């Protein structure tokens, strides 16, 4: 669909994320232009699976063990999409519990950005 | 326009940055639906500027003085628009020296997020 652009609201979308680590599960994601890898939280996947260590820019400049790094592909499914977007890595916030669809998926998507 | 996503290439776009500090700028700036607001680099402005304190919540946790808040509105020309973009403030990154056009911009070019 289109999603207008307001300050005052989140671009925010229902997405089913499926880890691979635990049973799928349906959560608010920001669409995130401007993000390029997308971004799951922790609360997602299992704490018996391994994820592994990368630094990620951010708002406060560089945060070292802020942000892990999937092991295993994750599927994202849009209320909109029959078929899944398949990531072969994104982000994990282990903090925040951040959700975030960035470009990586938004390719998929065939999303764009679009400026009258 | 109509910018594409992909993970690779960020959609970033020529702007003309008027601070009223000092003369029209083009920098090269992100475009950005997950940002609530603009943030264009202190090397826009004058040493001799006021600008206000303020917090913002980024990647990483906290951050109490990174980002700085204009006093004077910010004036911002795109390519494919003669009329400047106004924007009562918006945020100065006084060390990254980021370009980001957040959905303070986009909502007055009446942009929007597609996905088909
Ligand atoms: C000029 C280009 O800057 P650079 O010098 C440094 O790279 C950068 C690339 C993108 C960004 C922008 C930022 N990215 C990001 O953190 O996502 C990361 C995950 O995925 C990878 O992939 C690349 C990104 C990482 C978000 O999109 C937007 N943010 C909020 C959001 C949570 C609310 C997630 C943080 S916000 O904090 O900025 C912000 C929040 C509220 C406001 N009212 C105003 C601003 C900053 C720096 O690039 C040149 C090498």
């Known amino acids: 669909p289109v999603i207008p652009l307001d300050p005052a609201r989140r671009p925010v979308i229902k997405a089913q994320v499926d880890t691979q680590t635990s049973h799928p599960k349906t959560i608010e994601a920001l669409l995130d232009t401007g993000a ?18 990368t630094s990620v820019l951010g708002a406060g400049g560089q945060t070292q063990d802020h942000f892990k ?6 599927l994202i499914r849009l209320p909109f999409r029959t078929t899944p977007i398949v990531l072969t890595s994104c982000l994990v916030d282990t903090k925040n519990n ?5 470009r990586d998926a938004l390719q998929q998507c065939q ?5 009258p």
């Open 98 to 102: 951040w959700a975030i669809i960035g």
């Open 36 to 53: 390029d890898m997308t971004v799951i939280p922790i609360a997602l996947f299992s704490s018996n699976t391994p994820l592994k260590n």
């Open 69 to 74: 790094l999937t092991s295993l592909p994750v």
């Open 111 to 115: 999303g764009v950005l679009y400026l």
